[model samples]
Target: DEHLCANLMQLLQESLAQARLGSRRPARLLMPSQLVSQVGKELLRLAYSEPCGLRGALLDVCVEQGKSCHSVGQLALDPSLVPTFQLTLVLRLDSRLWKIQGLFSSANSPSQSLTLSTGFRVIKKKLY
Candidate 1:
């Protein structure tokens, strides 16, 4: 397992760094076979987390950021500020593992919202 872990770590460190920079092309282009698998597993981890909305969000981000070129060129794209935000959005969706129904709101009312909450009470007082 050491080999697997090492490969995973290396790929994650590189890919995540690149991801933070809003680019996965260079990492994907340069990664070793082992790292590729590890990175792929990580991607699948993302894909399975929130299948629908994240898919839509990713596409939206791609269109907004111009990184969508990968779909056609299969080239690496250096992520810009927008990609960073998009990546984080995708990650949040991944973390939630939301269901399709959760991604949508009832037709009779407003659509669901993706609200970001902060536990100020807990972080500032409860812990203290």
Candidate 2:
């Protein structure tokens, strides 16, 4: 849990810094708790689709991107623009662990090769 929280904070920090440099902002910035969960749940639903096997579900995640106030990093100024990002995820079938590679480029962050060897499980309740 600590690691996840840390990673999230790190991501928020990076995006916030990047936004301060440019007028355009990252979607991770402004949002209520409910909308964040809705977005997360939608992403999870897509990832847990039948096509995504237990071992690999590498994907490119795209979200709205547009101009924002450099100081606030809010997307309210423009909400219709689409920004894209490539997300590559690796999962271990033997242990149900998963790793998100290259999403965070921090030097002190966990090893790119590190894995939890547990968690990140997706169950298939029925055929789609």
Candidate 3:
């Protein structure tokens, strides 16, 4: 549908601007492919962390962090590392205010005032 594609393009444009406009921080917008990769990394992190609790998770995350090599504006993940574990990635396509009001206990916290609304979420698939 042309209309739907147009609408998506419009949303993408607004979303990108909301994420990237005049920001000191580099935008972390993840393409679908990159989201998939992030999911994998998260799974690995979770699995490593599960044995030791938050300590293990923090260690796994630290290990993962150590693998990044910044180049120009983007941090590159090791190709060897991303797909070796179980993970899920979620990209939030809404405003920060909306997120804080619904998702955070401290909805009106001063730090929540940042207008950056669009972001990504990466969670590990927990084994019950």
Candidate 4:
């Protein structure tokens, strides 16, 4: 869920650039995952499916905490840099896939940020 948590803002960031011509090969505005299932389907369908969707479209993103299930994080955006904006990506579990997402701002907030430390001292050396 890196794309949703840490990269939703950047993913939308890429869409704005993809509209430009001959920019490192055109990238298809493919749906990263099942975002449409929960919500944003119509907006995304129009943006990624319809013509003139990404062409010169405004894109901006902001992340916030959601009030729904899991609500690992919430995404909002101001396309015109005005007071108005919309929510984009939302972090949570899928129907059957059950992909769990968690906190990952500048600092980790996974409720239990566990890091496997089997190596202990063996792999603790700096990148020298």
Best by TM-score: 2
Order the candidate numbers by lDDT, best to worst. Answer: 3, 2, 4, 1
Better lDDT candidate (1, 3): 3
Could you tell me how far off, in angstroms, the CA of residue 46 lies in candidate 1 after the best superposition? 2.0
lDDT of 1 at 47: 35
Best by lDDT: 3
- Give every collision pair in model 2: none
Candidate 2 structure quality by residue, lDDT tens digits, 55-80? 12223212222222123222211124
* Model 2 segments more than 4 A misplaced: 1-28, 50-128
Q: TM-scores for all candidates?
A: 0.24, 0.28, 0.23, 0.23
lDDT score, candidate 3, position 112: 24
Q: Is candidate 1 or candidate 2 better by TM-score?
A: 2
**CA shift of 79, model 4, Å:** 15
For model 4, where is the 10-residue window of minimal lDDT? 117-126
* lDDT per residue as tens, model 3, 1-128: 23322343344434433343232432433235444344444434455554432222211111011233122111112322333332333344233323212544455544322322233444554433
Clashing residue pair totals per candidate (backbone < 3 A): 2, 0, 3, 0
Writing each residue's lDDT as its tens digit, candidate 4 over 1-128 gives 22232344355435522322222332223223343232333344434432333232233322221332221222233243332223233222222221223344447433331111111010111111
Worst 10 residues of 3 by lDDT: 56-65
